Write a protein that binds this DNA or RNA. Structure first.
Ligand code: MG
Ligand code: MG
Ligand code: MG
Ligand code: MG
Ligand code: MG
Ligand code: MG
Ligand code: MG
Ligand code: MG
Ligand code: MG
Ligand code: MG
Ligand code: MG
Ligand code: MG
Ligand code: MG
Ligand code: MG
Ligand code: MG
Ligand code: MG
Ligand code: MG
Ligand code: MG
Ligand code: MG
Ligand code: MG
Ligand code: MG
Ligand code: MG
Ligand code: MG
Ligand code: MG
Ligand code: MG
Ligand code: MG
Ligand code: MG
Ligand code: MG
Ligand code: MG
Ligand code: MG
Ligand code: MG
Ligand code: MG
Ligand code: MG
Ligand code: MG
Ligand code: MG
Ligand code: MG
Ligand code: MG
Ligand code: MG
Ligand code: MG
Ligand code: MG
Ligand code: MG
Ligand code: MG
Ligand code: MG
Ligand code: MG
Ligand code: MG
Ligand code: MG
Ligand code: MG
Ligand code: MG
Ligand code: MG
Ligand code: MG
Ligand code: MG
Ligand code: MG
Ligand code: MG
Ligand code: NA
Lengths: 46, 184
RNA sequence: UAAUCUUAUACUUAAUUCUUAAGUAAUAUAUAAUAUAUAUAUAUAUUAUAUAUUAUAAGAGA
RNA sequence: UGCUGACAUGAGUAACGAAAAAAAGGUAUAAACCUUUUCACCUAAAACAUAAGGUUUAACUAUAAAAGUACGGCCCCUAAUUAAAUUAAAUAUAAAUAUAUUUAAGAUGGGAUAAUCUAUAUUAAUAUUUAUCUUAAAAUAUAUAAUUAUAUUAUAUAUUAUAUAUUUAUAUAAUAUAAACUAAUAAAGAUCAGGAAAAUUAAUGUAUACCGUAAUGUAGACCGACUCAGGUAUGUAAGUAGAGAAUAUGAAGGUGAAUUAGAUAAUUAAAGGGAAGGAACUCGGCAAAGAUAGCUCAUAAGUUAGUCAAUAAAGAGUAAUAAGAACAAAGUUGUACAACUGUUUACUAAAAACACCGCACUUUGCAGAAACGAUAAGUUUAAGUAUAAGGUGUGAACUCUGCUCCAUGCUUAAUAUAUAAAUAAAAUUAUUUAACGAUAAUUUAAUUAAAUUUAGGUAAAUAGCAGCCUUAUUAUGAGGGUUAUAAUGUAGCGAAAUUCCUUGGCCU
RNA sequence: UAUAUUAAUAAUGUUAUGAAUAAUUAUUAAUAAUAAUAAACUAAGUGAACUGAAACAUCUAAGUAACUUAAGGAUAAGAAAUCAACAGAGAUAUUAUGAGUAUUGGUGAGAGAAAAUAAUAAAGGUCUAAUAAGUAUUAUGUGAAAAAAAUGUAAGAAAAUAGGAUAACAAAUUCUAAGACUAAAUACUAUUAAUAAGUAUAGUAAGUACCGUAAGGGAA
């Protein structure tokens, strides 16, 4: 069993979990977004 | 138990209807197996199943294969009826509570032997890992070199004693039980 | 046991719907009077006065 | 073993990543690019269609063309599940929030019509899993209506000839390969008992929206830091052969590569052969070698009766006698451990460990026991009800499972028995006050728990199962007498995976 | 579906008997809608641990970090049921002295006021309450290291002839709880000006490249 390939992309899943709207919808995600904005981040979410 | 397709069963939970009233004398007609009625109608001594608590609620006790209760006494003063359940616990049940006549079907269910692990899995039963097999962090019986019981009293993974320890105790006990079930 | 707890399930006035108030009709309970039937008591019918429109049923219960 | 930068050293060393290349020409510029021919490799793929993914890598900017029918999304519908949403007072909660209910979302699934092409809008009105046998039917041949042997047996279409509506329709008859495969049909075996959710006529409509479409996809175009021998879903996968998607070949298609040319010492790897011997090797037959049909027969002891053992070993038939493709097929036995098929340390342990089916104990009567819940409401348990569910040990079955409650627990009963907080009113004492009083302590009086203790019970609860003496001529010790205890190791097994002394004694 | 209805008209074509029913266009009137909003400062809730004590358990770190909630340009506090001591002062806030003093501590580690006098400060006093009860007080459990005011559970007053304040009591003194408002000095952010024995690795790029599934990290 060879490791290394732990990332296994699937756009839909990514957008569900780490997408902007998911962040927006949760309180915790909204807080994250705010924190990133404060930092100065160009890209707040996937 | 002896029910087979073609048999006829009534239910006298509402009461004795005007068909049978127009046409004890009624008790023997009524107390055929398979038909339901309040414990008031059911004569003392006879075997029953799907025994209720309350006069309105459904039959709760004695539902499993080959199981049954038995009417022991009835008290119209207090509106109760002492019933022996399958466990052996004598218990007050509302005198107007529901109960079917006869023993439950499939008496020989208990005698089945599952052949293999897979059958249990199909039924929906994942494997039980023994406390002695575990590590100490996981279960009190765990740890030790070789196989050991750690001088630890037989108990659950959360420290509740497994052999003999009465779990329903003190104030929170059953109010309606007349005589407790036979133990050991 | 109206301590606690558990379970189940019409019209008319005044500020299209909404709410108040009055009286009336309908149902239920309590109290008083009259008539009838049974063994001072119980049941039924009629009249007057008062109250109501979270409930009812089941269970546990100081 | 400071941090950052720059540059050395090893060193022009190893390596250049499974590989088959050759010539001619594009080009008097080519080992590496393009073409042609030859040769090879993959071929139930290294092919052809696709899914997901991605720096568009593509046959490219003059760029991947859809009203719908062996076209997908979008849309309708819902599953798993999700939701600062939903209900003077839904419930709970230090806040955050959590729960229940509604509603909404949510594909991996379901969704009308269609080449004789098809019309989706609006308005109105009342389907787990597997199987297709046997029988029976008729057909074809042998023998003398009936027997024997052999295939065929529900559906799928063109042709010809009839009979009815009128060359277009409906029905009937006859003609017509084998082996796979599909869909749709029917009947039906087994227990493990098999999703959810969204009407029909009539009239009036319908100018048909958006997005996906390249190429790559067992890979140089994704996930692995690399153009990485790893990981990566689905469908076709020429024939010949075969039981087959095994194995050989390879029609077609694709490919022959960011390393080449030579040389082939020692040495290493991965292969091929080997005289005489045949485990003498070694910790150990590790490794290697070993297959005298794969079809049809036949196949023992033992045994839990299961061709379990068995794919038995040997052996036969067919084939072959000097041999002459690949692939499947690699002995027999004794003992230890574990019933068995399974599971396990992803990346050093696959086991004797876990699990298991069975066995036993125990808890809980359901407004239960168990678990979860800053901690609740509540949830699972369960749409179950003691033949159930939770916990514990043991681990199929045969023969069996002895004695012991001392201790730690659990469990039952005793006002046997102490102590905690909680109370009236009233007695001295102390402080203060000129006095009563005020403020402190202390002591009295009825009504006291669970706990503890005592006595049972409970060991398939946690646990335990002693030593000395010396008696039948010597020996052995059936016996005999003691001490100690809760009881004093029973059946069995025994130098055991348990035996230190130990390479115990004896046999094979 | 607001280049929407719904109605009222006007123009057009069709149906059935001048009037009625539907469709299309054009005016007039009527009907709802758009959260991207700071961060720091403040107040409230919950509240660690490392650490110190040369161990560690009371204690400490600390009501700190953190998370959560809510407000305003500031917030908080504020016109004595305050301090003091027989003399007196007169809201609050910040600083200096008082003072590392009183006080307190497994009397260890260590913690530590107030009165008073100075500044800074603004006009700093002024009713808005028919004067405050399950309140004061008591018991008990907790509660800013000293100094309380708070608080869960339950008992529970008094009218200025009274009530609060100190172990307690007696004298005295002082204040009036259970109703309220309040600039100003202060905090933080931004801007402008001035001063730099500050910065060119604290001198403008970039929260980019790149790393990570993600929170997040982060160059030259
Ligand atoms: Mg990685
Ligand atoms: Mg997920
Ligand atoms: Mg187990
Ligand atoms: Mg273990
Ligand atoms: Mg533990
Ligand atoms: Mg052992
Ligand atoms: Mg240095
Ligand atoms: Mg060298
Ligand atoms: Mg060299
Ligand atoms: Mg080399
Ligand atoms: Mg050339
Ligand atoms: Mg093959
Ligand atoms: Mg392809
Ligand atoms: Mg939906
Ligand atoms: Mg789908
Ligand atoms: Mg494509
Ligand atoms: Mg294509
Ligand atoms: Mg990549
Ligand atoms: Mg790698
Ligand atoms: Mg590769
Ligand atoms: Mg082939
Ligand atoms: Mg070829
Ligand atoms: Mg290719
Ligand atoms: Mg290469
Ligand atoms: Mg040889
Ligand atoms: Mg030889
Ligand atoms: Mg040797
Ligand atoms: Mg070998
Ligand atoms: Mg035999
Ligand atoms: Mg083989
Ligand atoms: Mg095994
Ligand atoms: Mg391993
Ligand atoms: Mg291994
Ligand atoms: Mg294991
Ligand atoms: Mg089992
Ligand atoms: Mg519980
Ligand atoms: Mg059980
Ligand atoms: Mg075991
Ligand atoms: Mg057994
Ligand atoms: Mg035993
Ligand atoms: Mg006491
Ligand atoms: Mg031993
Ligand atoms: Mg705070
Ligand atoms: Mg320390
Ligand atoms: Mg230490
Ligand atoms: Mg502190
Ligand atoms: Mg203010
Ligand atoms: Mg006042
Ligand atoms: Mg006052
Ligand atoms: Mg107090
Ligand atoms: Mg401090
Ligand atoms: Mg006041
Ligand atoms: Mg104020
Ligand atoms: Na153990």
């Amino acid at each position: 069993k060879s490791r290394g390939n732990t990332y296994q992309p699937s756009t839909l899943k990514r957008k569900r979990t780490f997408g902007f709207l998911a962040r927006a919808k949760s309180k915790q995600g909204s807080k994250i977004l705010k924190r990133r904005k404060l930092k100065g981040r160009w890209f707040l979410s996937h | 138990d002896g029910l087979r397709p073609g048999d006829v069963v009534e239910s006298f939970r509402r009461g004795i209807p005007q068909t049978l009233l127009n046409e004890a004398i009624l008790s023997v007609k009524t107390t055929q197996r398979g038909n339901c009625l309040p414990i008031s109608m059911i004569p003392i001594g006879t075997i029953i199943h799907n025994v209720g608590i309350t006069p309105v609620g459904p039959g709760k006790f004695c539902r499993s294969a080959g199981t049954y209760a038995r009417v022991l006494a009835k008290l119209p003063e207090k509106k109760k009826a002492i019933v022996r359940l399958q466990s052996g616990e004598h218990r007050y049940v509302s005198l107007e509570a529901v109960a079917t006549i006869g023993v439950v079907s499939n008496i020989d269910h208990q005698n089945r032997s599952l052949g293999k692990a897979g059958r249990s899995r199909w039924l929906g039963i994942r494997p039980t890992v023994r406390g002695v097999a575990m590590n100490k962090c996981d279960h009190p019986h765990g740890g030790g070199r070789g196989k050991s019981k750690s001088n630890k009293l037989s108990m659950s993974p959360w420290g509740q004693l497994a052999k003999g320890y009465k779990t329903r105790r003190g104030k929170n006990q059953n109010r309606m039980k007349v005589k407790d079930r036979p133990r050991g």
